[PDB]
Amino acid sequence: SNADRVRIFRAEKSYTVQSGRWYFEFEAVTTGEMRVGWARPELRPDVELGADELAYVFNGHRGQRWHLGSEPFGRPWQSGDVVGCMIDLTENTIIFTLNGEVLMSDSGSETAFREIEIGDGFLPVCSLGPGQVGHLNLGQDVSSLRFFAICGLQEGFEPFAINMQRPVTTWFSKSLPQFE
């Protein structure tokens, strides 16, 4: 029996962060096997996110946090729900929200992961199992973030897209009349 095909959406490695406090969202359209969170710049093939050391993710199918394996955490997704992903590379913590409300661990903690090591740094990541549908928003248009202002903005987290600069081709001219 062939294994499930899982799509993994890496960010360009050149956007990797080793400092600061960053924020992005992920909308669950379906309600099944998807994961979202923060990845190392290297991922191994044919391994699910957070099964090993290379990612720290939330699985909202039933509510799990994944890093070196799974644990019960948060609560399950409904269609339309938006997961907020936060990483704090000064405090060294990861926090998830669901429709702007922090997802608490089973033990009662706001931090989903703590005492994380900066190492090679982090990138936003998601995985989509077969059939599944979900959209990242890395916050190019900050106002488009649905729950940032409710939890993340005042808390000092910045939209991750600030780390992403459009490549450009420039055309120079000395002609004032062209720039009126």
From Swiss-Prot:
The N-terminus is blocked. Residues 4-143 form the B30.2/SPRY domain. It is found in: Sarcoplasmic reticulum membrane. Detected in skeletal muscle (at protein level). Fast- or slow-twitch skeletal muscle. It comes from the Eukaryota. Binding of [3H]ryanodine indicates that the heterozygous channel is activated by Ca(2+) concentrations 4-fold lower than normal. Single-cell analysis of cotransfected cells shows a significantly increased resting cytoplasmic Ca(2+) level and a significantly reduced luminal Ca(2+) level. Homotetramer. Can also form heterotetramers with RYR2. Identified in a complex composed of RYR1, PDE4D, PKA, FKBP1A and protein phosphatase 1 (PP1). Repeated very high-level exercise decreases interaction with PDE4D and protein phosphatase 1 (PP1). Interacts with CALM; CALM with bound calcium inhibits the RYR1 channel activity. Interacts with S100A1. Interacts with FKBP1A; this stabilizes the closed conformation of the channel. Interacts with CACNA1S; interaction with CACNA1S is important for activation of the RYR1 channel. Interacts with CACNB1. The calcium release channel activity resides in the C-terminal region while the remaining part of the protein constitutes the 'foot' structure spanning the junctional gap between the sarcoplasmic reticulum (SR) and the T-tubule. Pore opening is mediated via the cytoplasmic calcium-binding domains that mediate a small rotation of the channel-forming transmembrane regions that then leads to channel opening. Belongs to the ryanodine receptor (TC 1.A.3.1) family. RYR1 subfamily. Cytosolic calcium-activated calcium channel that mediates the release of Ca(2+) from the sarcoplasmic reticulum into the cytosol and thereby plays a key role in triggering muscle contraction following depolarization of T-tubules. Repeated very high-level exercise increases the open probability of the channel and leads to Ca(2+) leaking into the cytoplasm. Can also mediate the release of Ca(2+) from intracellular stores in neurons, and may thereby promote prolonged Ca(2+) signaling in the brain. Required for normal embryonic development of muscle fibers and skeletal muscle. This is Ryanodine receptor 1. It comes from Oryctolagus cuniculus. The gene is RYR1.
